[PDB]
């Protein structure tokens, strides 16, 4: 499940249904789902036996769950292995993407 995504929506909004999977979101769901033409539409679970497969072709041509986790693996793992200046904060614990270290710290350190 579902017929379009893996662990897709059921009895929920169509734009949020396209906003379910790890990579299918709100803007792109409105974009490629807007190319399919739903707009919620039909707002719960009834798109089509041939429309939902239209989300299998238009909804299937893009990606990506394992490719998003794999690109992140080559990013925090790529720069985590190819260096780096993003690695020492990519796993070192401190703020990597820019912040104060005496700051709120609700990304890595906390309290």
């Amino acid at each position: 499940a579902r017929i379009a995504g893996v662990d897709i929506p059921r009895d929920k909004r169509v734009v949020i249904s396209l906003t379910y999977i790890f990579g299918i979101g709100r803007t792109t769901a409105q974009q490629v789902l807007k190319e399919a033409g739903v707009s919620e539409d039909t707002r719960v679970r009834d798109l089509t036996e041939e429309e939902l497969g239209k989300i299998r072709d238009i909804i299937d041509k893009l990606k990506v769950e394992g490719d998003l986790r794999r690109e992140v693996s080559l990013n925090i793992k790529r720069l985590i292995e190819i260096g780096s200046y993003r690695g020492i904060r990519h796993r070192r614990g401190l703020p990597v993407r820019g912040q104060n270290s005496k700051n709120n710290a609700r990304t890595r350190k906390g309290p």
Partner: protein, 64 residues
């Protein structure tokens, strides 16, 4: 085979979104199935599917 403990198994009709069908047996008279080996990219040779792995790595970054 104990009587009344084992559910009846009518001849199944497996189906798929790609229109592929398979004749087996199940408790249900008909069985729609989201994915089949004839549709799954791994079993179907080496289809590009979505990758195109290694594009690009470990380097290919140039612009003039």
């Amino acid at each position: 085979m104990k009587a009344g403990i084992h559910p009846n198994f009518k001849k199944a009709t497996v189906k798929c979104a790609c229109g592929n069908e398979f004749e087996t047996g199940s408790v249900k008279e008909e069985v729609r199935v989201e994915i089949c080996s004839e549709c799954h990219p791994f079993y179907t040779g080496r289809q590009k599917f979505a990758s195109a792995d290694g594009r690009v790595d470990r380097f290919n970054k140039k612009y003039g």
